[PDB]
Amino acid sequence: QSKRVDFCGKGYHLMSFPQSAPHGVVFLHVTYVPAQEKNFTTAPAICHD
Amino acid sequence: QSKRVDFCGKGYHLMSFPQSAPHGVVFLHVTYVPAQEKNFTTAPAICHDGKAHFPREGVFVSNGTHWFVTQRNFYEPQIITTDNTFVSGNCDVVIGIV
Amino acid sequence: IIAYTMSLGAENSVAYSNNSIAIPTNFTISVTTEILPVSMTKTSVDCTM
Amino acid sequence: PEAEVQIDRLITGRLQSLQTYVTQQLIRAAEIRASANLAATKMSECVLG
Amino acid sequence: YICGDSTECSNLLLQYGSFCTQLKRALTGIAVEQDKNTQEVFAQVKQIYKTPPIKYFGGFNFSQILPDPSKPSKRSPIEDLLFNKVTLADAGFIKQRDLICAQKFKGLTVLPPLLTDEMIAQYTSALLAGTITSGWTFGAGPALQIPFPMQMAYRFNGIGVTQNVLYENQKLIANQFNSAIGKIQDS
């Protein structure tokens, strides 16, 4: 599994499957694509006591 | 953010900024460079009462009197707790345990 | 104009021992440039001219 | 008038031979450059990290 | 190469003119490119690092890869073995029955490289001293010393293996490493 961005397809890479082709190879890059985001209010730290 | 060494500039890579150029591209590689290091006495493990203690994320260092856990790329000493360390084995098998 | 054997680099002996470690207490945010070619000038040649 | 065309035949032979040699040297130099870029990448990513 | 250099044959290469200069430019570019290739591969450090005079690294024996000072080449046993297994045919020297390098008399010379074998060996020695005494820290800033078992315990965490696996089997891992380095010369 590769952490290289867009080396193994667009998105967060999970798996890849080779397939034989005439004079070449075809990869089926299984990537994790985020979807349906929602806005939230964030903070760098929480002050308790 | 690339973990490949010297692929995105010298140092620990943080960001890069492309710039347009005639017949080319110019990258501005923002890297993290450590500086102002100090010598510390280290140990692979801490022997408390027969158990061997190893750091979860950091490193055991000493200032000469007391031992601390600090993170690996920045000096930030912390008290050696069971939250910072994990227990594996006993004290008889680790070479250099203190 | 002088001629010389090239200085291959600075000389540094790392203070190695079996129980000493060096950890930085500060840091430096460094920005460096990398100029790298992409394309070249497209030319077209007339045969008979 | 006849030695000129004989040596022009020979000189064009040596011109073609030298141009062929430099074309193969440029192709092999591109191959060695690709191998050396791979070697430098392996040095930086295997030895320095 | 074209003309016998005892003749007016060279007075007809002016009829073609810009062709020999184009080869001399192209071969000069190839030569500078080869020197650039060697410089990019081996000059990865700006400082020449040295090992400590006590070569004890927690049981890991690096004597077959560190340079041997008892030999004038200042190379490792593996490097001294590698230069002996390549039947080298360069002629990058001034020294003048005949061998294959009698092709110099036809105008075909060999230029010596900018970095000699000793300087490449010193770059390799600096890289080895850095990666033994400092880990990956010398390649991303200043060299930071660390014990080599502690370095290997950092390197076990990079592959998903906890630190106590190394320290409870340090002698075994050192013996496996020393056996595996010794099989490189045999292979």
Q: What is the DSSP string of B27-85?
A: EEEEEEEEEEEEEEEEES-EESSSEEEEESSSEEEESSS-EEEE-TTS---B---TTTE
Q: How far apart are the first and last CA of chain D?
A: 70
Nearest C-alpha of chain B: how many angstroms from E167?
A: 6
- Cβ pair D26:E13 closer than 8 A: no
Ramachandran angles phi, psi of B51, nearest 5°? -90, 150
Chains B, E: CB pairs < 8 Å: 61
Contact status, residue E41 vs residue D43, Cβ threshold 8 Å:
yes
- From CA D31, how far away is CA D18, in angstroms rounded? 20
If we measure between CA atoms, which residue out of E135, E130, E169 comes closest to residue E152? Answer: E135
- Cβ pair B94:E168 closer than 8 A: yes
Residues facing residue C23 across a β-bridge: B38
Contact status, residue E154 vs residue B72, Cβ threshold 8 Å:
yes
- Please tell me which of the candidates B24, B27, B33 has its beta carbon nearest to residue C28: B33
Helix (H, G, I), strand (E, B) or coil at B89: strand
Q: In one letter, which amino acid is A33? A: V
D1 touches chain B (CB under 8 A): no
Chains C and B touch (3+ CB pairs under 8 A): yes
- Please tell me which of the candidates D15, D26, D49 has its beta carbon nearest to residue E30: D26
Q: In one letter, which amino acid is E75? A: R
Contact status, residue B44 vs residue B61, Cβ threshold 8 Å:
no
Resolution, given in Å to one decimal, reads: 2.8
- From CA B15, how far away is CA D20, in angstroms rounded? 46
C-alpha distances (whole Å) from E102 to each of E86, E109, E110 are 21, 10, 12
Q: With breaks defined as C to next N over 2.5 Å, after which residues does chain E break?
A: 96
| C-chain residues near B75 (CB < 8 A) | 23-25
E170 touches chain B (CB under 8 A): yes
- Cβ pair D41:B5 closer than 8 A: no
* Helix E117-133, helix E77-84: angle, nearest 10: 150
| B-chain residues near D41 (CB < 8 A) | 7
- Cβ pair C9:E56 closer than 8 A: no
**Cβ-based neighbour number of residue C21 at 10 Å:** 24
Contact status, residue B79 vs residue B55, Cβ threshold 8 Å:
no
- From CA D41, how far away is CA D47, in angstroms rounded? 10
E28 touches chain C (CB under 8 A): no
Chains E and D touch (3+ CB pairs under 8 A): yes
- From CA D10, how far away is CA D21, in angstroms rounded? 17
Nearest C-alpha of chain C: how many angstroms from E88?
A: 25
- Interface partners of chain D (CB pairs < 8 Å, 3 or more) are B, E
Nearest C-alpha of chain C: how many angstroms from B49?
A: 22
Report the residue of chain D nearest B4, measured CA to CA. D45
Give alpha helix (H) positions in chain E.
20-42, 77-84, 117-133, 148-157, 163-167, 170-186
CA angle (B75 as vertex; B71, B76 as ends), nearest 5:
70
D41 touches chain B (CB under 8 A): yes
E63 touches chain B (CB under 8 A): no
Q: For residue E9, with 0-12 CB atoms within 10 Å meaning exposed, 13-18 middle and 19 or more buried, which class applies?
A: middle
Q: Which residue has the tokens 């692929």?
A: B7
Report the residue of chain B nearest C39, measured CA to CA. B23
**Cβ-based neighbour number of residue B13 at 10 Å:** 20
Contact status, residue E136 vs residue E151, Cβ threshold 8 Å:
no
Instruction: Report the 3 state secondary structure along chain C.
Output: CCCCCCCCCEEEECCCCCCEEEEEEEEEEEEEEEEEECCCCCCCCCCCC
Structure token digits, residue E13: 């290469």
Give E 52-111 residues with CB within 8 A of chain C. 52, 56, 58
- From CA B11, how far away is CA B34, in angstroms rounded? 8
- From CA B55, how far away is CA D14, in angstroms rounded? 72
**Cβ-based neighbour number of residue A21 at 10 Å:** 8
Contact status, residue E40 vs residue D40, Cβ threshold 8 Å:
yes
- From CA E133, how far away is CA C17, in angstroms rounded? 9
- From CA C26, how far away is CA B34, in angstroms rounded? 6
- Cβ pair C8:E45 closer than 8 A: no
Contact status, residue B28 vs residue B16, Cβ threshold 8 Å:
yes
Interface residues of A toward B, Cβ cutoff 8 Å, are 3-5
- From CA E78, how far away is CA E21, in angstroms rounded? 43
